[PDB]
Design a protein around this motif. Structure first.
Motif, PDB file in Angstrom:
ATOM      1  N   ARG A   1       0.706  -1.110  -0.088  1.00 52.54           N
ATOM      2  CA  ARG A   1      -0.171   0.052  -0.016  1.00 52.54           C
ATOM      3  C   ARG A   1       0.831   1.456  -0.004  1.00 52.54           C
ATOM      4  N   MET A   2       2.063   1.202   0.730  1.00 49.39           N
ATOM      5  CA  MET A   2       2.923   2.395   0.846  1.00 49.39           C
ATOM      6  C   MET A   2       3.515   2.869  -0.561  1.00 49.39           C
ATOM      7  N   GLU A   3       3.310   1.907  -1.600  1.00 47.91           N
ATOM      8  CA  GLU A   3       3.778   2.333  -2.868  1.00 47.91           C
ATOM      9  C   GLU A   3       2.841   3.458  -3.486  1.00 47.91           C
ATOM     10  N   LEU A   4       1.735   3.216  -3.098  1.00 47.12           N
ATOM     11  CA  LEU A   4       0.512   4.149  -3.601  1.00 47.12           C
ATOM     12  C   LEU A   4       0.828   5.797  -3.030  1.00 47.12           C
ATOM     13  N   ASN A   5       1.443   5.694  -1.769  1.00 42.43           N
ATOM     14  CA  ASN A   5       1.926   6.620  -1.112  1.00 42.43           C
ATOM     15  C   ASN A   5       3.197   7.459  -1.722  1.00 42.43           C
ATOM     16  N   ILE A   6       4.309   6.586  -2.107  1.00 45.11           N
ATOM     17  CA  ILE A   6       5.235   6.863  -2.513  1.00 45.11           C
ATOM     18  C   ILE A   6       5.132   7.568  -3.981  1.00 45.11           C
TER      19      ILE A   6
ATOM     20  N   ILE B   1      -0.335   8.675  -5.857  1.00 40.50           N
ATOM     21  CA  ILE B   1      -1.564   8.068  -6.338  1.00 40.50           C
ATOM     22  C   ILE B   1      -2.642   8.199  -5.213  1.00 40.50           C
ATOM     23  N   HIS B   2      -2.389   7.761  -4.078  1.00 33.10           N
ATOM     24  CA  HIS B   2      -3.285   7.728  -2.906  1.00 33.10           C
ATOM     25  C   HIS B   2      -2.486   8.060  -1.737  1.00 33.10           C
ATOM     26  N   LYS B   3      -2.766   9.119  -1.165  1.00 29.94           N
ATOM     27  CA  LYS B   3      -1.924   9.701  -0.062  1.00 29.94           C
ATOM     28  C   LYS B   3      -2.216   8.915   1.336  1.00 29.94           C
ATOM     29  N   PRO B   4      -3.382   8.790   1.934  1.00 34.19           N
ATOM     30  CA  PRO B   4      -3.540   8.397   3.202  1.00 34.19           C
ATOM     31  C   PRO B   4      -2.783   6.946   3.453  1.00 34.19           C
ATOM     32  N   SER B   5      -2.308   6.781   4.845  1.00 34.99           N
ATOM     33  CA  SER B   5      -1.982   5.668   5.217  1.00 34.99           C
ATOM     34  C   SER B   5      -2.623   4.343   5.051  1.00 34.99           C
ATOM     35  N   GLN B   6      -3.740   4.789   5.818  1.00 30.63           N
ATOM     36  CA  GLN B   6      -4.948   3.712   6.287  1.00 30.63           C
ATOM     37  C   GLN B   6      -6.078   3.966   5.564  1.00 30.63           C
TER      38      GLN B   6
ATOM     39  N   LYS C   1     -20.132  16.841  -9.067  1.00 29.57           N
ATOM     40  CA  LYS C   1     -19.165  17.423  -9.979  1.00 29.57           C
ATOM     41  C   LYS C   1     -18.853  16.400 -11.270  1.00 29.57           C
ATOM     42  N   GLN C   2     -19.216  15.321 -11.131  1.00 33.54           N
ATOM     43  CA  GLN C   2     -18.844  14.231 -12.172  1.00 33.54           C
ATOM     44  C   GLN C   2     -17.273  14.435 -12.487  1.00 33.54           C
ATOM     45  N   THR C   3     -16.576  14.574 -11.666  1.00 32.08           N
ATOM     46  CA  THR C   3     -15.160  14.426 -11.606  1.00 32.08           C
ATOM     47  C   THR C   3     -14.559  12.923 -11.505  1.00 32.08           C
ATOM     48  N   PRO C   4     -13.579  12.679 -12.192  1.00 28.87           N
ATOM     49  CA  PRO C   4     -13.006  11.228 -12.082  1.00 28.87           C
ATOM     50  C   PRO C   4     -12.537  10.752 -10.897  1.00 28.87           C
ATOM     51  N   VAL C   5     -12.586   9.487 -10.480  1.00 35.37           N
ATOM     52  CA  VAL C   5     -12.065   8.820  -9.413  1.00 35.37           C
ATOM     53  C   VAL C   5     -11.175   7.702  -9.761  1.00 35.37           C
ATOM     54  N   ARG C   6     -10.055   7.969  -9.199  1.00 38.86           N
ATOM     55  CA  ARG C   6      -9.012   6.369  -9.408  1.00 38.86           C
ATOM     56  C   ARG C   6      -9.583   5.440  -8.594  1.00 38.86           C
ATOM     57  N   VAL C   7      -9.584   4.187  -8.939  1.00 40.87           N
ATOM     58  CA  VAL C   7      -9.856   3.059  -8.126  1.00 40.87           C
ATOM     59  C   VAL C   7      -8.740   2.084  -8.131  1.00 40.87           C
ATOM     60  N   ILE C   8      -8.354   1.473  -6.831  1.00 37.69           N
ATOM     61  CA  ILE C   8      -7.460   0.891  -6.643  1.00 37.69           C
ATOM     62  C   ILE C   8      -7.993  -0.497  -5.929  1.00 37.69           C
ATOM     63  N   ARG C   9      -7.757  -1.592  -6.558  1.00 41.59           N
ATOM     64  CA  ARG C   9      -8.417  -2.587  -5.939  1.00 41.59           C
ATOM     65  C   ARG C   9      -7.376  -3.562  -5.262  1.00 41.59           C
ATOM     66  N   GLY C  10      -7.873  -3.808  -3.578  1.00 43.10           N
ATOM     67  CA  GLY C  10      -6.943  -4.369  -3.059  1.00 43.10           C
ATOM     68  C   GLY C  10      -7.460  -5.726  -2.532  1.00 43.10           C
TER      69      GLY C  10
ATOM     70  N   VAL D   1      -4.205  -3.540  -7.431  1.00 41.59           N
ATOM     71  CA  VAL D   1      -4.203  -3.048  -8.787  1.00 41.59           C
ATOM     72  C   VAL D   1      -4.917  -1.810  -9.109  1.00 41.59           C
ATOM     73  N   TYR D   2      -4.355  -1.077  -9.968  1.00 48.72           N
ATOM     74  CA  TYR D   2      -4.842   0.179 -10.643  1.00 48.72           C
ATOM     75  C   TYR D   2      -5.819  -0.133 -11.564  1.00 48.72           C
ATOM     76  N   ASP D   3      -7.060   0.107 -11.257  1.00 46.16           N
ATOM     77  CA  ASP D   3      -8.147  -0.430 -12.325  1.00 46.16           C
ATOM     78  C   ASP D   3      -8.643   0.804 -12.989  1.00 46.16           C
ATOM     79  N   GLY D   4      -7.958   2.061 -12.979  1.00 47.11           N
ATOM     80  CA  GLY D   4      -8.535   3.098 -13.691  1.00 47.11           C
ATOM     81  C   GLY D   4      -9.451   4.215 -13.174  1.00 47.11           C
ATOM     82  N   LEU D   5     -10.166   4.952 -14.095  1.00 46.36           N
ATOM     83  CA  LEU D   5     -10.988   5.907 -13.632  1.00 46.36           C
ATOM     84  C   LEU D   5     -12.503   5.711 -13.679  1.00 46.36           C
ATOM     85  N   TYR D   6     -13.203   6.366 -12.694  1.00 45.32           N
ATOM     86  CA  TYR D   6     -14.654   5.845 -12.526  1.00 45.32           C
ATOM     87  C   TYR D   6     -15.382   7.291 -12.352  1.00 45.32           C
TER      88      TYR D   6
END
Ligand SMILES: C[S@@+](CC[C@H](N)C(=O)[O-])C[C@H]1O[C@@H](n2cnc3c(N)ncnc32)[C@H](O)[C@@H]1O
Ligand SMILES: [Zn+2]
Ligand SMILES: [Zn+2]
Ligand SMILES: [Zn+2]
Ligand SMILES: [Zn+2]
Length: 488
Positions: free
Chosen positions: A78-83, A86-91, A147-156, A165-170
């Motif tokens: 998960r910390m790769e997302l932080n590095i 892509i996804h800031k929070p730790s938990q 806002k219909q703004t895109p959201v990144r989805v990461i499947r864990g 797995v980064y599954d893309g924009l939703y």
């Protein structure tokens, strides 16, 4: 442009540091190992990279696509997302940023069992957050509807093998509230995948598991010789794989029959920790070059494995590439590079892929090559010490050629990339002849399933010559953002 490369290299540096720390722990006696008592190699590696300024996109939120990060990308920690930012929070499962007077979600981690039905693959149901409150993350995910703004989805997945797995924009379409099974209200959100993106990797894997799979044109190019069958897929044309004599193991001609190497004196798995001398550990310069899970710690000029007369059991930690292929490989037709190789599951960084098998020949015999030089692999000095140098900042060519034109294994089908996910590693075990090591391919990336496997052919420009004897050119079609444009 080079952002894809900087992302991959950043990850490579992170995992290199992880496997070094782990190697260090695995070298200690079982009684002094930290692995039990709360060793967090991901956190130590993370800290090291952070304190040396290696984090990308730090302190900046990004909405939508992140440069250098592509759909299908996999992460072990998960910390790769932080590095990567892509996804800031730790938990927390939801990450968000300011949008006008409000806040919208940039990223979510759908950790768990996910729905695997094919006719709902574009739709995702996500739980929020003893009642859940429409604040912070939940509120932001709700504002994303407006806002219909895109959201990144990461499947864990609920380790090591394609855990994130980064599954893309939703887009978030709606939300509601319902009693969860813990007894209080939870929020539920429906998201829909934005059209036009690469297909989800779990969808492709699922479709690939069928016997009615599109383009399946051969069950086993191995003809029953590999322990698991290697199939061939062609969704491009009606062409079938080239014919050749499949050969699982490298067979030495009589001119280089192995002189028996210097053996081992260990009745069980070789390790640094067990304190009596292991000659094979000294061959590797006092270290075990593999982690205890079979992954290579880091590229080296040469790796020495235990051989036929070592008293070690098959599961010795110094016995890896000699056991042959373990991954479910297959070959497939590319658009413009002939046949290529890929795997039906995720390949963890450091994993052994396969050997480059073929007929061994001396160089001189090599320069007289007639017919097919497509399948000539020249051994000697492909070792890349870049990663080792980078990490240090944190913490003899061969004449011989392997000819797989007539006899070889699946390795002959691996293509070239200027941004490769594999590298060639020289390994010795059944002999100690430096001129003719085994050529063993290892992953230098966490490789998503069905991603083409590729290494650097390493031809020098303007030194590949004609049938009549002069300089020949070939264009590189590897598609990488930083392509050197010529194969030779
Ligand atoms: C060892 S063979 C690999 C398997 C081969 N593609 C096949 O279909 O049999 C090497 C040949 O594949 C093609 N190839 C591999 N990588 C390429 C690349 N990046 N760009 C263009 N052609 C490539 C070239 O024709 C090269 O001579
Ligand atoms: Zn051993
Ligand atoms: Zn030993
Ligand atoms: Zn040994
Ligand atoms: Zn290229």
């Amino acid at each position: 442009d080079s952002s894809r490369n900087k992302v991959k290299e950043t990850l490579r540096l992170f995992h290199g540091v992880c496997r070094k720390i782990l190697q260090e722990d695995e070298a200690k006696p079982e009684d002094q190992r930290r692995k039990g008592k709360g060793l967090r190699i991901d956190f130590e590696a993370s800290t090291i990279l952070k304190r040396n300024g290696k984090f990308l996109n730090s302190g900046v939120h990004i909405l939508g696509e992140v440069p250098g990060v592509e759909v299908g990308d996999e992460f072990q920690y998960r910390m790769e997302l932080n590095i990567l930012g892509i996804h800031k929070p730790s938990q927390a499962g939801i990450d968000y940023m300011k949008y006008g007077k409000a806040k919208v979600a940039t990223s979510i981690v759908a950790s768990g069992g996910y729905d695997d039905h094919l006719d709902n693959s574009d739709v995702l149901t996500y739980t929020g957050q003893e009642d859940q409150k429409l604040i912070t993350g939940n509120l932001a995910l709700a504002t994303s509807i407006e806002k219909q703004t895109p959201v990144r989805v990461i499947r864990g997945k609920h380790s090591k093998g394609g855990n994130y797995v980064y599954d893309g924009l939703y887009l978030v379409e709606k939300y509601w509230q319902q009693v969860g099974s813990h007894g209080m209200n939870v929020f539920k959100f429906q998201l829909r995948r934005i059209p036009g993106q690469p297909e989800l990797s779990w969808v492709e894997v699922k479709k690939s598991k069928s016997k009615y799979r599109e383009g399946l044109c051969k069950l086993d190019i191995s003809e029953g010789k590999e322990q698991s069958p290697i199939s061939a897929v062609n969704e491009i044309d009606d062409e079938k794989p080239p014919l050749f004599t499949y050969t699982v193991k490298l067979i030495y001609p009589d001119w280089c029959r192995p002189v028996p190497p210097k053996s081992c004196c260990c009745t069980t798995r070789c390790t640094e920790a067990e304190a009596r001398v292991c000659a094979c550990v000294e061959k590797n310069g006092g270290e075990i070059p593999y982690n205890f899970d079979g992954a290579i710690v880091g590229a080296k000029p040469t790796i020495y494995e235990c051989g036929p007369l070592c008293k070690c059991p098959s599961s010795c930690y110094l016995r890896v590439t000699q056991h042959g292929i373990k991954l479910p490989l297959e070959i497939f037709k590319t658009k413009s590079r002939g046949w290529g190789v890929r795997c039906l599951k995720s390949i963890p960084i450091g994993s052994f892929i396969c050997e480059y098998v073929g007929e061994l020949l001396e160089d001189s015999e090599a320069e007289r090559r007639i017919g097919n030089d497509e399948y000539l692999f020249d051994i000697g000095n492909r070792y890349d010490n870049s990663l080792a140098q980078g990490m240090s900042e944190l913490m003899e060519s061969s004449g011989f050629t392997i000819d797989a034109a007539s006899k070889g294994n699946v390795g002959r089908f691996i293509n070239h990339s200027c941004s490769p996910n594999l590298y060639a590693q020289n390994v010795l075990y059944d002999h100690e002849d430096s001129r003719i090591p085994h050529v063993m391919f290892f992953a230098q990336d966490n490789i998503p399933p069905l991603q083409e496997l590729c290494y650097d052919y390493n031809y020098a420009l303007d030194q590949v010559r004609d049938s009549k004897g002069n300089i020949k050119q070939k264009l590189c079609f590897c598609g990488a953002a930083v392509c050197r444009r010529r194969l030779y």
